[PDB]
């Protein structure tokens, strides 16, 4: 379909952001990944309305 590839592209974008955030820190954190997981969860809620 299309929604599966759309969520795949969105997940790849946010996984690139999470990889560079977790890599380039000295001793990394938790809350930016928490924010992006909440963003993926609210998108999982967003695709159900249609």
């Amino acid at each position: 379909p299309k929604v599966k590839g759309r969520i795949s592209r969105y997940l790849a974008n946010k996984c690139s952001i999470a990889s560079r955030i977790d890599n380039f820190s000295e001793k990394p954190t938790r809350h930016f990944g928490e924010v992006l997981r909440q963003q993926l969860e609210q998108r999982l809620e967003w695709y159900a309305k249609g």
Partner: protein, 120 residues
């Protein structure tokens, strides 16, 4: 973290004016993934990176490929200003403006990358 940071006195605005000129000339790639793909395909002449980015690791991952391919890179301090200069209606955090064999923009490109190589 961003050690080749551009300073105030008419270098940031020269950068953004050359960015707008290249965006009119259709010789410019917008966004982090397009800058990365343009540098890895080697067509890039210079790359502008925002420094006001929420967490900076994106415009920290781009300078590694730029240092491996030896193209100049420079940080401007506002992604909102970079998006306004490109003409996007969204904030852009990474801008790579490419090379063509015949233009008049390439003089601005050459003077700009001379100033950036002096900045590094």
């Amino acid at each position: 973290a961003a050690w080749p940071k551009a300073e105030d006195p008419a270098l940031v605005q020269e950068l953004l004016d050359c960015v707008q000129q290249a965006s009119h000339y259709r010789q410019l790639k917008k966004g982090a993934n397009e800058t990365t793909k343009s540098v890895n395909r080697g067509t890039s002449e210079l790359v502008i990176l925002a420094a006001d980015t929420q967490p900076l690791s994106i415009v920290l991952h781009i300078p590694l490929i730029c240092e491996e391919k030896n193209v100049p890179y420079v940080y401007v301090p506002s992604k909102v200003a970079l998006g306004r200069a490109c003409g996007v209606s969204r904030a852009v955090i990474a801008v790579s403006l490419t090379s063509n064999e015949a233009s008049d923009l390439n003089s601005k490109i050459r003077a700009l990358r001379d100033k950036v190589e002096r900045l590094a």
